[PDB]
Amino acid sequence: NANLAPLPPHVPEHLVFDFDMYNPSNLSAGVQEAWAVLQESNVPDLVWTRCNGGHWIATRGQLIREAYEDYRHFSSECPFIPREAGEAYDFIPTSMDPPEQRQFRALANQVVGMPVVDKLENRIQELACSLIESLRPQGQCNFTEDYAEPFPIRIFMLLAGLPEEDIPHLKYLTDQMTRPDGSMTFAEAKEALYDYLIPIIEQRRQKPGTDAISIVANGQVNGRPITSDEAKRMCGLLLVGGLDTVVNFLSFSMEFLAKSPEHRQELIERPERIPAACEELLRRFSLVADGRILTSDYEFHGVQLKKGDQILLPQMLSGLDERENAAPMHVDFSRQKVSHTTFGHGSHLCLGQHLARREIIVTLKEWLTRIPDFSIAPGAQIQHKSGIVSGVQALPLVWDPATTKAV
Ligand code: HEM
Protein backbone atom coordinates (compact mmCIF):
# COMPACT_ATOMS: atom_id res chain seq x y z
CA ASN A 1 0.00 0.00 0.00
CA ALA A 2 0.98 3.64 -0.55
CA ASN A 3 0.69 4.48 3.15
CA LEU A 4 3.76 2.41 3.99
CA ALA A 5 7.22 3.96 4.04
CA PRO A 6 9.87 1.67 2.48
CA LEU A 7 11.54 -0.51 5.10
CA PRO A 8 15.01 0.79 6.07
CA PRO A 9 17.98 -1.55 5.42
CA HIS A 10 18.71 -1.88 9.13
CA VAL A 11 15.22 -3.03 10.20
CA PRO A 12 14.63 -6.85 10.16
CA GLU A 13 11.84 -7.99 7.84
CA HIS A 14 10.33 -10.42 10.36
CA LEU A 15 9.78 -7.56 12.83
CA VAL A 16 7.43 -5.63 10.56
CA PHE A 17 3.92 -5.11 11.90
CA ASP A 18 2.11 -2.27 10.19
CA PHE A 19 0.23 -0.72 13.10
CA ASP A 20 -1.30 2.72 12.43
CA MET A 21 -1.65 4.65 15.69
CA TYR A 22 -4.07 7.19 14.19
CA ASN A 23 -6.36 4.63 12.56
CA PRO A 24 -5.80 1.08 13.92
CA SER A 25 -7.52 -1.79 12.11
CA ASN A 26 -9.50 -3.20 15.05
CA LEU A 27 -10.88 0.22 16.08
CA SER A 28 -14.53 -0.90 16.03
CA ALA A 29 -13.93 -3.34 18.91
CA GLY A 30 -12.78 -0.46 21.09
CA VAL A 31 -9.58 1.59 20.96
CA GLN A 32 -7.92 -0.24 23.88
CA GLU A 33 -8.88 -3.53 22.21
CA ALA A 34 -7.51 -2.16 18.93
CA TRP A 35 -4.10 -1.46 20.46
CA ALA A 36 -4.24 -4.77 22.31
CA VAL A 37 -3.73 -6.64 19.02
CA LEU A 38 -0.08 -5.65 19.50
CA GLN A 39 -0.02 -8.06 22.43
CA GLU A 40 -1.60 -11.08 20.72
CA SER A 41 0.29 -14.37 20.47
CA ASN A 42 3.19 -14.46 17.99
CA VAL A 43 3.68 -10.67 18.17
CA PRO A 44 7.23 -9.70 19.32
CA ASP A 45 8.19 -7.41 22.24
CA LEU A 46 9.45 -4.80 19.78
CA VAL A 47 8.11 -4.30 16.25
CA TRP A 48 8.51 -1.88 13.35
CA THR A 49 5.54 -0.26 11.64
CA ARG A 50 5.88 1.24 8.17
CA CYS A 51 2.89 3.48 8.88
CA ASN A 52 3.21 7.19 9.66
CA GLY A 53 6.73 7.47 8.25
CA GLY A 54 8.06 4.33 9.92
CA HIS A 55 8.90 3.79 13.58
CA TRP A 56 9.51 1.22 16.33
CA ILE A 57 6.80 0.21 18.82
CA ALA A 58 7.45 -1.42 22.18
CA THR A 59 4.44 -3.68 22.78
CA ARG A 60 5.04 -4.80 26.36
CA GLY A 61 5.24 -3.04 29.71
CA GLN A 62 8.75 -4.36 30.39
CA LEU A 63 10.30 -2.52 27.42
CA ILE A 64 8.02 0.53 27.69
CA ARG A 65 9.15 1.03 31.28
CA GLU A 66 12.88 0.46 30.60
CA ALA A 67 13.00 2.88 27.68
CA TYR A 68 11.23 5.65 29.62
CA GLU A 69 13.88 5.26 32.32
CA ASP A 70 16.77 5.43 29.83
CA TYR A 71 16.73 9.08 28.72
CA ARG A 72 20.36 8.99 27.56
CA HIS A 73 19.46 6.58 24.74
CA PHE A 74 15.80 7.49 24.36
CA SER A 75 15.44 11.28 24.07
CA SER A 76 12.28 13.35 24.63
CA GLU A 77 13.61 15.88 22.13
CA CYS A 78 11.44 14.38 19.38
CA PRO A 79 8.53 12.72 21.25
CA PHE A 80 5.70 12.69 18.68
CA ILE A 81 4.93 10.43 15.71
CA PRO A 82 5.11 11.41 12.84
CA ARG A 83 8.64 12.87 12.58
CA GLU A 84 7.51 16.35 11.44
CA ALA A 85 5.32 16.58 14.54
CA GLY A 86 8.14 15.43 16.82
CA GLU A 87 10.55 17.98 15.37
CA ALA A 88 8.12 20.92 15.77
CA TYR A 89 7.30 19.77 19.30
CA ASP A 90 9.18 22.09 21.64
CA PHE A 91 6.91 22.15 24.69
CA ILE A 92 8.53 22.59 28.09
CA PRO A 93 9.52 20.54 30.00
CA THR A 94 8.38 17.57 27.89
CA SER A 95 10.73 18.13 24.93
CA MET A 96 13.73 18.20 27.27
CA ASP A 97 15.78 15.49 28.93
CA PRO A 98 17.43 15.71 32.35
CA PRO A 99 19.52 17.43 33.55
CA GLU A 100 18.15 20.50 31.73
CA GLN A 101 14.52 19.38 32.13
CA ARG A 102 14.24 19.51 35.91
CA GLN A 103 14.41 23.26 36.64
CA PHE A 104 11.36 23.83 34.42
CA ARG A 105 9.47 20.86 35.85
CA ALA A 106 9.60 22.34 39.34
CA LEU A 107 8.01 25.54 38.04
CA ALA A 108 5.22 23.67 36.26
CA ASN A 109 4.65 21.44 39.29
CA GLN A 110 3.98 24.62 41.29
CA VAL A 111 1.01 25.66 39.15
CA VAL A 112 -0.84 22.33 38.79
CA GLY A 113 0.50 20.27 41.68
CA MET A 114 -1.24 18.93 44.78
CA PRO A 115 -1.35 22.19 46.81
CA VAL A 116 -3.15 23.85 43.88
CA VAL A 117 -5.58 20.94 43.56
CA ASP A 118 -6.52 21.18 47.24
CA LYS A 119 -7.52 24.84 46.96
CA LEU A 120 -9.46 23.98 43.78
CA GLU A 121 -11.41 21.23 45.55
CA ASN A 122 -14.62 23.10 46.33
CA ARG A 123 -15.02 24.70 42.90
CA ILE A 124 -14.49 21.30 41.30
CA GLN A 125 -17.13 19.81 43.61
CA GLU A 126 -19.61 22.60 42.86
CA LEU A 127 -19.20 22.46 39.07
CA ALA A 128 -19.81 18.70 38.93
CA CYS A 129 -22.90 18.93 41.13
CA SER A 130 -24.15 21.90 39.10
CA LEU A 131 -23.77 20.14 35.75
CA ILE A 132 -25.26 16.84 36.91
CA GLU A 133 -28.34 18.40 38.54
CA SER A 134 -29.24 20.34 35.39
CA LEU A 135 -28.95 17.15 33.33
CA ARG A 136 -30.84 14.95 35.80
CA PRO A 137 -34.56 15.56 35.18
CA GLN A 138 -34.06 15.44 31.40
CA GLY A 139 -33.53 11.68 31.30
CA GLN A 140 -30.85 11.97 28.61
CA CYS A 141 -27.59 13.66 27.62
CA ASN A 142 -24.81 13.77 25.03
CA PHE A 143 -22.12 13.01 27.60
CA THR A 144 -19.07 14.26 25.64
CA GLU A 145 -20.56 17.72 25.06
CA ASP A 146 -22.66 17.84 28.23
CA TYR A 147 -20.12 16.82 30.85
CA ALA A 148 -16.78 15.36 29.74
CA GLU A 149 -15.77 18.54 27.94
CA PRO A 150 -17.06 21.45 30.06
CA PHE A 151 -16.36 19.89 33.49
CA PRO A 152 -12.56 19.56 33.32
CA ILE A 153 -12.08 22.30 30.71
CA ARG A 154 -13.90 25.02 32.68
CA ILE A 155 -11.83 23.94 35.68
CA PHE A 156 -8.56 24.44 33.80
CA MET A 157 -9.66 27.74 32.25
CA LEU A 158 -10.40 28.93 35.79
CA LEU A 159 -6.95 27.85 36.95
CA ALA A 160 -5.29 29.55 33.96
CA GLY A 161 -7.32 32.76 34.26
CA LEU A 162 -8.68 32.41 30.74
CA PRO A 163 -12.21 33.21 29.39
CA GLU A 164 -14.44 30.20 28.68
CA GLU A 165 -15.55 31.70 25.37
CA ASP A 166 -12.04 30.87 24.11
CA ILE A 167 -12.59 27.12 24.68
CA PRO A 168 -13.93 26.26 21.19
CA HIS A 169 -10.81 27.72 19.51
CA LEU A 170 -8.28 26.28 21.95
CA LYS A 171 -9.98 22.87 22.10
CA TYR A 172 -9.85 22.58 18.31
CA LEU A 173 -6.13 23.44 18.37
CA THR A 174 -5.23 20.82 21.00
CA ASP A 175 -7.22 18.12 19.18
CA GLN A 176 -5.21 18.76 16.01
CA MET A 177 -2.05 18.00 17.99
CA THR A 178 -3.39 14.68 19.27
CA ARG A 179 -5.92 13.40 16.71
CA PRO A 180 -5.53 15.63 13.63
CA ASP A 181 -8.50 15.55 11.23
CA GLY A 182 -6.23 16.67 8.40
CA SER A 183 -7.06 20.37 8.29
CA MET A 184 -3.97 21.28 10.33
CA THR A 185 -0.42 20.03 10.86
CA PHE A 186 1.08 19.89 14.36
CA ALA A 187 3.31 22.82 13.38
CA GLU A 188 0.37 25.02 12.38
CA ALA A 189 -1.63 24.13 15.50
CA LYS A 190 1.30 24.86 17.82
CA GLU A 191 2.12 28.18 16.14
CA ALA A 192 -1.54 29.21 16.54
CA LEU A 193 -1.49 28.12 20.18
CA TYR A 194 1.67 30.17 20.69
CA ASP A 195 0.02 33.06 18.82
CA TYR A 196 -2.80 32.95 21.37
CA LEU A 197 -0.47 32.97 24.37
CA ILE A 198 2.06 35.67 23.36
CA PRO A 199 0.16 38.87 24.18
CA ILE A 200 -1.38 37.28 27.28
CA ILE A 201 2.07 36.36 28.57
CA GLU A 202 3.40 39.87 27.93
CA GLN A 203 0.47 41.62 29.64
CA ARG A 204 0.72 39.32 32.66
CA ARG A 205 4.44 40.04 32.98
CA GLN A 206 3.54 43.73 33.36
CA LYS A 207 0.50 43.23 35.60
CA PRO A 208 1.07 39.88 37.39
CA GLY A 209 -1.89 37.91 38.73
CA THR A 210 -2.40 34.71 40.73
CA ASP A 211 -3.50 32.55 37.79
CA ALA A 212 -1.30 29.74 36.45
CA ILE A 213 -0.26 31.83 33.45
CA SER A 214 0.92 34.72 35.64
CA ILE A 215 2.81 32.30 37.88
CA VAL A 216 4.71 30.68 35.00
CA ALA A 217 5.37 33.93 33.15
CA ASN A 218 6.85 35.63 36.23
CA GLY A 219 8.53 32.57 37.72
CA GLN A 220 12.18 31.64 38.12
CA VAL A 221 14.10 28.56 37.03
CA ASN A 222 16.90 27.54 39.41
CA GLY A 223 17.13 31.16 40.55
CA ARG A 224 17.10 32.99 37.22
CA PRO A 225 14.08 34.72 35.59
CA ILE A 226 12.17 32.74 32.96
CA THR A 227 12.15 34.25 29.47
CA SER A 228 9.08 35.06 27.36
CA ASP A 229 9.71 32.19 24.91
CA GLU A 230 10.20 29.68 27.73
CA ALA A 231 6.95 30.69 29.44
CA LYS A 232 5.11 30.39 26.12
CA ARG A 233 6.47 26.88 25.55
CA MET A 234 5.44 25.82 29.06
CA CYS A 235 1.97 27.40 29.04
CA GLY A 236 1.13 25.83 25.68
CA LEU A 237 1.68 22.37 27.14
CA LEU A 238 -0.52 23.14 30.14
CA LEU A 239 -3.41 23.99 27.80
CA VAL A 240 -2.97 20.63 26.04
CA GLY A 241 -2.86 18.64 29.29
CA GLY A 242 -5.92 20.49 30.56
CA LEU A 243 -8.06 20.35 27.42
CA ASP A 244 -7.50 16.88 25.93
CA THR A 245 -6.77 14.36 28.71
CA VAL A 246 -9.40 13.98 31.46
CA VAL A 247 -12.02 15.01 28.88
CA ASN A 248 -11.47 11.81 26.96
CA PHE A 249 -10.95 9.49 29.90
CA LEU A 250 -14.27 10.41 31.53
CA SER A 251 -16.14 9.24 28.42
CA PHE A 252 -14.37 5.85 28.44
CA SER A 253 -15.32 5.28 32.09
CA MET A 254 -18.93 6.38 31.68
CA GLU A 255 -19.36 4.35 28.49
CA PHE A 256 -18.26 1.34 30.52
CA LEU A 257 -20.52 2.17 33.47
CA ALA A 258 -23.57 2.61 31.23
CA LYS A 259 -22.94 -0.85 29.76
CA SER A 260 -22.24 -2.48 33.13
CA PRO A 261 -25.08 -2.27 35.71
CA GLU A 262 -23.27 -4.74 38.00
CA HIS A 263 -20.38 -2.31 38.34
CA ARG A 264 -22.57 0.75 38.97
CA GLN A 265 -24.35 -1.23 41.69
CA GLU A 266 -21.04 -2.12 43.33
CA LEU A 267 -20.14 1.56 43.71
CA ILE A 268 -23.67 2.55 44.73
CA GLU A 269 -23.76 -0.02 47.55
CA ARG A 270 -20.10 0.64 48.45
CA PRO A 271 -19.08 4.25 47.62
CA GLU A 272 -15.79 3.93 49.52
CA ARG A 273 -14.50 1.81 46.65
CA ILE A 274 -14.60 4.79 44.27
CA PRO A 275 -10.89 5.70 44.61
CA ALA A 276 -9.86 2.08 43.88
CA ALA A 277 -12.32 1.90 40.99
CA CYS A 278 -10.76 5.09 39.64
CA GLU A 279 -7.32 3.50 39.43
CA GLU A 280 -8.68 0.36 37.77
CA LEU A 281 -10.57 2.40 35.20
CA LEU A 282 -7.35 4.39 34.72
CA ARG A 283 -5.62 1.09 33.92
CA ARG A 284 -8.29 -0.59 31.77
CA PHE A 285 -9.06 2.61 29.87
CA SER A 286 -5.55 4.05 29.49
CA LEU A 287 -5.39 6.35 26.48
CA VAL A 288 -2.03 8.10 25.91
CA ALA A 289 0.77 6.97 23.61
CA ASP A 290 3.86 9.01 22.77
CA GLY A 291 7.57 8.15 22.61
CA ARG A 292 11.25 8.98 22.21
CA ILE A 293 14.05 9.34 19.65
CA LEU A 294 17.36 7.46 19.66
CA THR A 295 20.39 9.62 20.49
CA SER A 296 22.84 7.02 19.15
CA ASP A 297 23.06 3.52 17.70
CA TYR A 298 21.94 1.12 20.40
CA GLU A 299 21.08 -2.56 20.66
CA PHE A 300 17.88 -2.91 22.67
CA HIS A 301 16.44 -6.33 23.51
CA GLY A 302 18.26 -8.05 20.66
CA VAL A 303 17.20 -5.33 18.23
CA GLN A 304 19.55 -2.85 16.53
CA LEU A 305 18.22 0.68 16.86
CA LYS A 306 19.88 3.38 14.76
CA LYS A 307 20.50 7.01 15.72
CA GLY A 308 17.48 9.11 14.75
CA ASP A 309 15.07 6.16 14.80
CA GLN A 310 11.78 7.01 16.49
CA ILE A 311 10.20 4.63 18.98
CA LEU A 312 6.59 4.78 20.20
CA LEU A 313 6.33 3.76 23.87
CA PRO A 314 2.58 3.44 24.44
CA GLN A 315 1.71 4.34 28.04
CA MET A 316 -1.64 2.69 27.28
CA LEU A 317 -0.16 -0.74 26.59
CA SER A 318 1.59 -1.40 29.91
CA GLY A 319 -1.49 -2.00 32.08
CA LEU A 320 -3.22 -3.97 29.33
CA ASP A 321 -0.26 -6.35 29.21
CA GLU A 322 -1.34 -9.72 30.63
CA ARG A 323 2.25 -9.95 31.87
CA GLU A 324 1.50 -7.13 34.34
CA ASN A 325 -2.17 -7.87 35.04
CA ALA A 326 -4.00 -11.20 34.73
CA ALA A 327 -7.20 -10.96 32.68
CA PRO A 328 -6.26 -7.35 31.83
CA MET A 329 -9.41 -6.71 29.78
CA HIS A 330 -11.65 -7.46 32.77
CA VAL A 331 -12.57 -4.60 35.10
CA ASP A 332 -12.14 -5.64 38.74
CA PHE A 333 -12.64 -2.88 41.31
CA SER A 334 -11.10 -5.24 43.87
CA ARG A 335 -8.01 -6.01 41.75
CA GLN A 336 -5.19 -6.45 44.24
CA LYS A 337 -2.23 -4.94 42.38
CA VAL A 338 -3.26 -2.41 39.73
CA SER A 339 -0.20 -2.04 37.50
CA HIS A 340 -0.05 0.67 34.83
CA THR A 341 1.88 3.53 33.21
CA THR A 342 -1.21 5.61 32.45
CA PHE A 343 0.40 8.81 33.76
CA GLY A 344 3.74 7.94 32.19
CA HIS A 345 7.00 6.67 33.64
CA GLY A 346 10.50 8.04 34.29
CA SER A 347 11.46 11.70 34.79
CA HIS A 348 8.45 12.97 32.82
CA LEU A 349 5.73 11.59 35.12
CA CYS A 350 2.39 13.43 34.78
CA LEU A 351 2.24 16.65 36.80
CA GLY A 352 -1.52 16.93 36.34
CA GLN A 353 -2.30 13.44 37.63
CA HIS A 354 -3.40 14.78 41.02
CA LEU A 355 -5.84 17.15 39.32
CA ALA A 356 -6.95 14.27 37.10
CA ARG A 357 -7.73 11.85 39.95
CA ARG A 358 -9.77 14.43 41.85
CA GLU A 359 -11.80 15.21 38.74
CA ILE A 360 -12.44 11.51 38.07
CA ILE A 361 -13.30 10.60 41.67
CA VAL A 362 -15.67 13.54 42.11
CA THR A 363 -17.46 12.80 38.84
CA LEU A 364 -18.02 9.17 39.89
CA LYS A 365 -19.39 10.05 43.35
CA GLU A 366 -21.60 12.95 42.28
CA TRP A 367 -23.06 11.17 39.25
CA LEU A 368 -23.91 7.87 40.93
CA THR A 369 -25.67 9.45 43.92
CA ARG A 370 -27.88 11.47 41.57
CA ILE A 371 -28.19 9.30 38.46
CA PRO A 372 -27.52 5.71 39.65
CA ASP A 373 -29.28 3.93 36.79
CA PHE A 374 -28.55 4.86 33.19
CA SER A 375 -27.58 3.31 29.86
CA ILE A 376 -26.56 3.95 26.27
CA ALA A 377 -29.23 5.36 23.94
CA PRO A 378 -31.02 2.48 22.16
CA GLY A 379 -29.28 1.43 18.94
CA ALA A 380 -26.29 3.73 19.51
CA GLN A 381 -23.06 2.56 17.86
CA ILE A 382 -20.21 4.03 19.92
CA GLN A 383 -17.20 5.16 17.86
CA HIS A 384 -13.71 5.66 19.25
CA LYS A 385 -10.83 7.67 17.79
CA SER A 386 -7.11 6.95 18.06
CA GLY A 387 -3.96 9.08 18.34
CA ILE A 388 -1.39 10.54 20.76
CA VAL A 389 -4.35 10.69 23.12
CA SER A 390 -7.39 8.53 22.30
CA GLY A 391 -11.03 9.45 22.90
CA VAL A 392 -14.75 8.95 22.33
CA GLN A 393 -16.58 10.52 19.38
CA ALA A 394 -19.98 10.71 21.10
CA LEU A 395 -21.68 9.12 24.10
CA PRO A 396 -25.51 9.38 24.13
CA LEU A 397 -27.00 8.34 27.48
CA VAL A 398 -30.59 7.74 28.59
CA TRP A 399 -32.24 7.28 31.99
CA ASP A 400 -35.61 7.35 33.75
CA PRO A 401 -35.95 10.63 35.74
CA ALA A 402 -38.13 8.88 38.34
CA THR A 403 -35.19 6.64 39.28
CA THR A 404 -32.99 9.64 40.09
CA LYS A 405 -32.37 11.59 43.32
CA ALA A 406 -31.50 15.14 44.39
CA VAL A 407 -28.72 15.62 46.96
C1 HEM B 1 -6.39 11.26 32.60
C2 HEM B 1 -5.57 12.30 32.76
C3 HEM B 1 -4.12 12.38 32.23
C4 HEM B 1 -3.33 11.43 31.68
C5 HEM B 1 -3.64 9.93 31.43
C6 HEM B 1 -2.05 12.02 31.34
C7 HEM B 1 -0.93 11.42 30.76
C8 HEM B 1 0.39 11.90 30.71
C9 HEM B 1 1.58 11.25 30.21
C10 HEM B 1 1.63 9.84 29.60
C11 HEM B 1 2.63 12.09 30.36
C12 HEM B 1 4.10 11.79 29.96
C13 HEM B 1 4.36 12.03 28.48
C14 HEM B 1 5.81 11.71 28.17
O1 HEM B 1 6.46 11.00 28.98
O2 HEM B 1 6.32 12.17 27.12
C15 HEM B 1 2.17 13.33 30.97
C16 HEM B 1 2.90 14.47 31.32
C17 HEM B 1 2.48 15.78 31.64
N1 HEM B 1 1.19 16.18 31.96
FE1 HEM B 1 -0.41 14.65 32.13
N2 HEM B 1 -2.16 13.35 31.71
C18 HEM B 1 -3.38 13.63 32.26
C19 HEM B 1 -3.82 14.87 32.73
C20 HEM B 1 -3.14 16.08 32.86
C21 HEM B 1 -3.67 17.35 33.32
C22 HEM B 1 -5.12 17.57 33.77
C23 HEM B 1 -2.69 18.27 33.29
C24 HEM B 1 -2.88 19.75 33.71
C25 HEM B 1 -1.97 20.69 33.45
C26 HEM B 1 -1.47 17.64 32.80
C27 HEM B 1 -0.19 18.17 32.59
C28 HEM B 1 1.00 17.52 32.24
C29 HEM B 1 2.31 18.13 32.09
C30 HEM B 1 2.66 19.62 32.30
C31 HEM B 1 3.28 16.99 31.71
C32 HEM B 1 4.79 17.15 31.42
C33 HEM B 1 5.66 16.44 32.44
C34 HEM B 1 7.09 16.53 31.96
O3 HEM B 1 7.30 16.64 30.72
O4 HEM B 1 8.01 16.50 32.82
N3 HEM B 1 -1.82 16.34 32.56
N4 HEM B 1 0.82 13.13 31.14
Ligand SMILES: CC1(C)[C@@H]2CC[C@@]1(C)C(=O)C2
Ligand atom coordinates in the same frame (compact mmCIF):
# COMPACT_ATOMS: atom_id res chain seq x y z
C1 LIG C 1 1.48 13.27 25.89
C2 LIG C 1 0.70 14.23 26.78
C3 LIG C 1 -0.60 13.60 27.27
C4 LIG C 1 1.50 14.83 27.91
C5 LIG C 1 0.60 15.93 28.45
C6 LIG C 1 -0.21 16.38 27.24
C7 LIG C 1 0.45 15.57 26.14
C8 LIG C 1 -0.28 15.50 24.80
C9 LIG C 1 1.84 16.11 26.03
O1 LIG C 1 2.36 16.24 24.94
C10 LIG C 1 2.63 15.55 27.19
Ligand SMILES: [K+]
Ligand atom coordinates in the same frame (compact mmCIF):
# COMPACT_ATOMS: atom_id res chain seq x y z
K1 LIG D 1 11.54 18.88 18.75
